[PDB]
Every structure is written in structure tokens, then in C-alpha cells.
Symmetry: D4
């Protein structure tokens, strides 16, 4: 089980990048909306009662959701910085620069897909079905690259 | 009453800048240490039971203390970004870029003194003794500037 | 009474975010346009004769309005950095990095709404009607978040 | 098993922060030095034959080690940006901004301790002994904070 | 022979800027697509067997292609940072800040044309036909500038 | 006489901002196009033979025109950084950070109008007709501000 | 006459760089200390009654002195950003990014010497004795460079 | 032949990093000092008469030396940004962001060693003795890495 928490409905586009990946691997997950600032009790309640092995927090601006989620559990918390101002430099450092003792796994700005893959790599350590799918997923990717090469090769001759 | 909360004992130097100002104006205040990440329940407990009209939160790195304090009260929360990495650019945006609805008054990096003055200006709206002291404080400052001018004037002639 | 001063008519969009909030709380306020550079005497005149307990200064670029307003009064001065160039990094530091003795409460870039809320939180210390409205305002916000959660919950099942 | 790889012996100080944490939890680990640029075959060889469930890559400058390690395994790869120039802004984005499909869990600059904790949180999903230790570790941390509060409380009275 | 390698088909626009220059000088070249992260074996294979005297690597984000290409050959490797996020500041430092011993010639962001010219200047050291064309190319450029001057001169009179 | 030099015809929009100001003050000026990189001999020739008391150089990217112009004369050289990449941060520092001995007066990015005004303020020191016009120009500006205030005043009542 | 105004006695080191240059050219000047924030009436008074043809304002942090000085006169105002925080990026943009109509000539951070030279180049337009000295000053500089070349030439042979 | 040009004697430390590399490969080279701003005629004269196949320009601040050198020759010009202010961000973009047609090969800040290696890789295309030495140089480097690994391996057991 993977729990995806959006600090705002504005993070839906990035959150769906994650969901579409999780749906392709056939894994269980939940998608929630909860503000660390506006509804601290909803976040707390979602986290403390979740059965998720991995949390994916998605927020922009002075993104404090990832940090708040991590302070409520010892499960791995992945943060996805969303660019809503200053081209994502706010949400990036606001979530990556956590203090000693309470870490947060940070991925690139708007990288919901990489957040889902990271979460699957963590689960794959216990679920061999997921590990196998990860290897196949990489193969699929090499193949798209070969196809790009083949196509471009026919371009400027 | 003014409540000063440090996210870490590393913020003491900046926190004392604030205290020394509050001591010169003869006003009531409290100085506490509480981590938004490590001890969310201590922060919550300090804020929800404080009698302070103004909160001064001082933290560095991915400073989330100011934000967490503001989400627990409707009283004015002043944040003081502390430079512990990336010359304070982290704690700055992490506290200033709050989301709509839950604001935080931000002052310059390591500006504990300006945080105390801002807090006094807020109290002065209800305490005429403080308002008077603020005006006198400004006069004192102009005088130090005149003295600098007088001194420099005698320098390169 | 709250006094909103725009350094330019270009700041109207951000200034209206503030006004709409003040109108919802039913509080007195004034909206003015005055340049710190082009009309220093109008700014001076507006500030020195205002009956406002809180000043909200809104300017972009090398925003010096907040600083100039604060140097003319001991009342709390809230600055709203407007992004007109360099994605608001100019107006941000130009108003937040004030020197010791003359502080300015800074909120996020284009955050006129947060500027109005901050101003109300200050007034609420003396006006219980405003304090009550602030608490209700927060409740309203939690409710919009719950509604977002409920809606998103029905999305990917 | 956790595999720590340093791109340079210059990363030892940060690498030891990690080791000291792993030693306190009594977990198996390896510490290696391998350059992604100078010895790509050593990195490849270390990764492809490691029995580690989690990789911790530590490099500075145009840090490409984390990325190269992640491209060689599907196991979680944690990157620790080291500040050797431009106050760590190079190694930060160079490792965090990975492309879709090949993610890297990034922690703060020089945060070797947070890298080890993150790795343990991942292992804890399969090792209950580690999960228990994580909870105890957090308790220990709250206690240091309470002690800081108690101490500071006796300071300005 | 010059070998142009794109880390992604998204770099085609910038890659064509290079090709169009190489086509005007009548020199041999190859255009390939290969990901340093997704297909490390294709990159390795392309580089180790290329007969190119100069390599032009074009990638965005945490661009690691230039670095990986340079670690596989002693031939000059020119990197072209592509702006796909953070206005190209990622790919810039990620390729320019190489470590001692394995250098990479970096040109401006999206400067595929300057990458091709740089490559020709290198070849010109051995091919006098190219050296001559470079001098003629510069003359052509001065002429476009004179024409701009002549045109603008007739503008505001 | 004022000499405006554009490093590229791409700087025309910003250059016209300057011209329109100079035309309103009725002063003599020249508008030229010359590249510091592509046509160093045209720049040299224009500068060494100009009768201008003030030079206005307008260039973007790694703007070296201002610097090159200043190294060819002892007359005041005003630089106007043009944002063509990295939101003007390149051309800004590339022209402002001159080395001791050869200064360049720098104005804001794309501020051709401020460049013309600065040039007129310099000429006004010798031409009383220009000095008078500068004072009138400022009056005109205060008046536009008063009109903005009057208009906005009628807005939210 | 040239008027140098320091916003703080902390700017003395940079201010002396300017004075030493002015003393070598044998020109009249004044050195003053006046805060735009703390003593707006002293700044106003100094500027409105100065007989200076050129003003050199030196301030750090959210440097507003240059802007305030320029709003009080039509004489050329040169700003010298002082690095007291964020390596001078605050004072730089805070003074360079002036709004249309009220320009400020900006030189590099801590470049008091370049500020004095710029001021002399302006005066030289009316004082031929200064113009001559500027040309001689440049000759002296070329000579120090030749001497560096001669010395280095004997170094690695 | 390789020509190293320093814009200032302040660049000696970085320039020697280059020389020491060139001395180890036993190749011909010259070390000169010439300012693009202060002595444009010395730079011009050095470049136009040099027999060097590769130019290495080393300058800090608003580094314009690399650009000026490249505008005087069609030979490859390598720039080494020197950090003398703003941690090298000035000299970096000032030399890397060249305009179309006149490229400059840029290496990391203070990377004189990488500048020399890049220059040798260019010469190696015509000198097989240098090509061979480059391959040996890389072997030597792998060996230092293996030695670091061996040493660290014995450290925490």
C-alpha cells in the first residue's frame, strides 16, 4: 500500500503522474488531499492510521506537507516539489533541507512519476512481483530510446 | 506577553538578539525550545496554551517552525530565518512563502532584533507605554547616526 | 482602520486580493497609490496623517515603498512583494532585508490575501469581533480542504 | 545490508556521519570509494554484485555518482549532495533532477546522517528490529529537545 | 567526423541547430539518441566505437550525458545544456562542474550552433579546408552586423 | 550628443525606449548596431570617433558590449542588460561586475528609458536647458501618480 | 564637488576606497553618514543643500539609500552595493532595479573605487583637468599590467 | 603550443594548476598577463601573433577575457571562471553565455587543471604522443581511486 497525499487540489496534475504509474504496476494505493497548514488534524489522522509502507507527499510553495508527514511516521516519505512560484525552488529546498533525524526522500520538481517508481523500488524489496516488474519497466524504457535512435538516424541523411 | 520559540538551541545567538530588545522595553516574554519535526506535541502544547499576543519563531534550514506555529494560532507569528546553510535562502523562502489563509510575518535573516521590534509595534497598538518607548527608541537611533556622521566628518579632512 | 498603499497602479490585481478579504471581514480600510521614488511627499503625507493601526505596502521591482512607509511610522507595516521582473526576487529581498530598528513584516510574493489576514490578526488583538471572524475563517478553510479530499477520493477508484 | 559509495575520499567526513548512525543501529554495511567519471568499471562492479537493499551515494560538484548508481540497479539509491563549490547547489540539482524512470532519493546537503536514517526506514519495512529501533531513536531525539527547553528556560529569568 | 548524441528526442530542436551548421561546412557527422540513465550500454557502445574526433552531447535536466560520454573517451566532448526546467541552470552546472581529470567543454544553454562551431574550430587544426571556412564564416557574420547597422541608421532620423 | 550602441538588432525594443525619451527632450543622439564579438573593429571605430559625451550600450546574454565600449573611452558608459536568457541575470552581472579602473554605469534590465534619463542627468550638468527639462519631467511623473491615486480612490468605495 | 553618503559606518572600508581615488585626482568632496530608514530628514537635508554635481551612495542589505538620494535630486546618483549578507545580492538588485523615471548608476559590489572613477568621468565632461587625469590614470593602469606580464613571463621558464 | 592568458596576477594560483599539468605532459606553452579592459592592445597583440593551437583564458568577476580572446582568433579558446566574488557565478555566465558564432569552451570554476587537460585532448588529435599520455594519465587516476577504496575499506571494520 502506498499513500499519496496532496496539500492542494492544485497538485492533481502531478499527483496523477504518480497514480498512472501505480496503476500500471497493479499496486494498492490511496489518494488524499490534506493541508499541513489548514488541516493539520486531517494529515495527522491520515498518517497515523494509514497501512501504507510508503508515503508520497505532493505540495508546492513553502511546501511543509512532506516534513509534517515524515514527523508523524517512521515509514519512508517521498516528497514531490511542485512549481507554483519561483520555478519550484521554494518547495524544493523547503522539503529537501530537512533537519537531522527526520529525513524525507526528495525527487525532482513535478516528478510524480519518479516518486511512484521510487516507492515501488522500496516495496520491491519485499514484493518480488514488483521487483520483476521494475526490471521489465526498465527494459521497456531502453526500447523507447532505441526507437528514438532508429528514428533520428533516418532524419538527416 | 510575547512567546519566542527556537526550533533548536543553535538559534540561541539570534534568539538573544530578540530577548535583549524585549528586556530594554521592560516587557513580559518567554523563551522556549521546541522542534516542529522532532517534538510536534511540545510545539502544539506551547502554542495552544500560551497567553502571548505575538509569537516569534526562530529556525534554520527547511524552517517549518514558523509555519507550524501559525497553523496552531490566529495570533501574529513572526518568523526569523536563520542561516545554517545556503546563506539562509532555505529558511527564508520556507517561512515567507506560506499559502493563502495562514500568513507569517517574515523579517530578514538572523534579524532577531527586528523581530522583537515588530512584536513591540504590534503590542504598542494596545499598550501606550510601549508606543511611547518605540518613538523614543527611534530617536535614540537617529542620534547614533548623527554621531556617526559627526565622527566621519572629522575623518578625511 | 487599515491603510493599503500601492506604489503603482500595476499592483492593483494584488491589491484587490487584499481588499476582497477586508470586505469579507467588514473592516474599515483605505486604498491609495503613491510612489516612494516619484512622489515621496504624497507617501509621507498619507502615512503621517493616517489613522490606520496597520499599513499594507504593495510594490514591485526594487520595492522601496514598504521600507519608506515603515520609516515614517511605528505602526506595523506589511510588505507584499510583486513579481514584475526576476520572478519577484527583487521586491522580496528589497523589502524583507530591512536594517535593525526599522522592521517590515513580509509575506509571500503576490500574497495580498495573506497580507490582509495578517493585518486582521493584528487588529484582532484589540477587536474581539475580528478575532472571532478569524477563527470562523479558518474553519471555512478546513471545510474546503475536506471537500477537496472527498472529491479526489471518488476520482481514481 | 546497506552500501555506501563515496565518489571521492573528500566525502569521508559526510560518509562517517552515515556510518556512525548505522553502527548505532547495529546493521550491516559496506563503505566504498569509486568515481563515476574516473572508474566507471569499479562503480558498475560494486553495484552489480552488491547484496545491499539500499545504496547511499555521496559525491560533490557535478555529482553524477548517485545517477550512475541508480542506472545500474533497481534498489533504492539515496544521494547525499556534498558542498565543495557553490555551497552545494551543484551536487544538489545534479542528483535530484533525475529524468523520468530512474529516480534517486535525495536528502539535504551534507546530510549523511539523514541518508542513513532514510536507509534504515526502508529496511525497517522488512526488519522489525530496525523498525523498533527507529521509534526509540525518535524518542531519544524528543528528549534532547526537552532538555534544551529545560536548559534555555533557566537562561533569561 | 563529429558525433552528436542526444539524451532525448526532446533535444532535437537544439540538435538541429548543430546539424544545420555542420551541413553548411560540408563535414561528416552522425546524430544519435542515447540515454546515460536508461541505456548506458548504448552510449558506451556508440562512444567506444565512434571514429569521431569530437563529441557533442546534448541533454537537459540533471544532464549526465556529457559527463558519461567524456568518461568513455579522451576525445574532446562538448556539452550543450538544454533548458527543460529551472531555465537551464540544472543542465548547466551538471555538465560544467566536472571533476579534475575528466573535462567537458561547455557552451551556453541551447547553443547547438556554438557547439558545432567549437567542434569545427577543433577540426580546423588538422583540416585547412575547415580553417578557411571558419574565417569566411566570421566575415559573413560581420556583414550581417553591418547590414543591421545600416538598416537601424535609417530608422530614427 | 549621446551615442546608443546595440550589440544586436534584437535589442531594438529596449533601444527605442531610450530613443523615445531622448526625442522628448529634444537632444542630439545616434543609434548604432555593433557586436563586441562579431565586429570589434566597428565598435572601436564608432567609439573612438564619436563626439558623444555619454555612451549607452545595450546588449543581452554574456553582454560584453558595455565593457568593451568603456575600455575604449573615458566618457561615461551606461549599460542596459537585456533579458534574452536566464531572465537577464547574465547580462546584468556581466556588465555590472566590471574590474577596478574601468567602470560602467548599470541600470535595471530592459530599462532603456532609465538609461536615457541617466544620460540626460549627466548632460544637464553642462546644459541648463536639459536640467530644467529634467525637473519638469519629474513634475509630470508626480502628476501621473496623483491621477492614479485619484482614480483608485473612487474604486472600492 | 562630489558627495559620498554612507548609510552606515559599516560602509567605511568601501567608502575609503572611493575617497583615496578622489584624493589622488585632487578633487573636492564630502563624506557623510545618513540612514534612509533611521534618519530620512538628514539624508533629505544633505541632498537638497549639496552643491555636488555627483552623488555616491554606499549601503548594504536592503539598500534603499541610493534610491532615496536619487528621488531627492536630478544629479547623477551612483550606488555602491555593499555585501553584508547574501554575498551582496540584496543591495545589488535593491539599488539597480529602480523604476522608470528615477535612475541610479550602479557599479559592482564593494566597488568604491569604480564609483569614484565613474564620478570623475562625469565631472571630466566639464573639467578638462580631470579628463586629462583620467587618460593618465588609464596609462598608469596599462603599465601595472605590462609589469605583471613581464614578471609572470620570468616565472615558469 | 598552448597559450595561457591571465586577466590578472590574481589568477596565478588557478593558472599554475594548468601549468603543472602541461609540464607533466612535456608540452610547449606560454603564460601571459593581459587585461581585456585595461590593455586591449596587449591581448590583441598576443593573440594575433600567437602560434598556439589552443588558448586558455583565465579571469574572474565580469570575466570578458575569454570572449575577447575568442573574438580575435578561430582557434579553440578555453575559459576558466575564477571565483573572486559571488562564488564565481559572475565569471561563469559571463564567459559561458557567448553569442552564436563566437563560442568559448568553458570548464568549471577554478578548474585550471581541467582546462589544461581539455587543451591536451585537442592537441592529441594531431599529436599521437599526447594521445598516448592522456590514456596513461587516466590509468594513473583510476589507480589513485582504487588506492582510496583499499584504504577506506580498512577504515570502519
Amino acid at each position: 500500500m502506498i499513500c499519496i497525499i496532496m496539500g492542494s487540489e492544485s497538485d492533481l496534475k502531478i499527483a496523477e503522474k504518480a497514480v498512472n504509474i501505480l496503476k500500471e504496476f497493479g499496486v494498492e494505493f490511496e489518494v488524499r488531499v490534506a493541508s499541513a497548514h489548514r488541516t493539520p488534524e486531517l494529515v495527522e489522522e491520515i498518517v497515523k492510521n494509514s497501512k501504507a509502507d510508503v508515503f508520497i507527499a505532493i505540495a508546492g510553495l513553502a511546501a511543509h506537507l512532506p516534513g509534517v508527514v515524515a514527523s508523524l511516521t517512521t515509514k519512508p516519505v517521498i516528497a514531490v516539489p511542485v512549481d507554483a512560484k519561483l520555478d519550484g525552488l521554494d518547495a524544493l529546498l523547503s522539503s529537501v533541507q530537512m533537519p537531522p533525524g527526520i529525513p524525507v526522500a526528495t525527487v525532482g520538481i513535478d516528478r510524480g512519476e519518479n516518486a511512484a517508481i521510487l516507492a515501488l523500488e522500496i516495496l520491491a524489496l519485499k514484493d518480488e512481483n514488483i521487483a520483476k516488474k521494475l526490471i521489465e519497466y526498465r527494459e521497456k524504457m531502453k526500447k523507447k530510446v532505441y526507437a528514438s535512435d532508429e528514428k533520428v538516424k533516418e532524419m538527416f541523411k
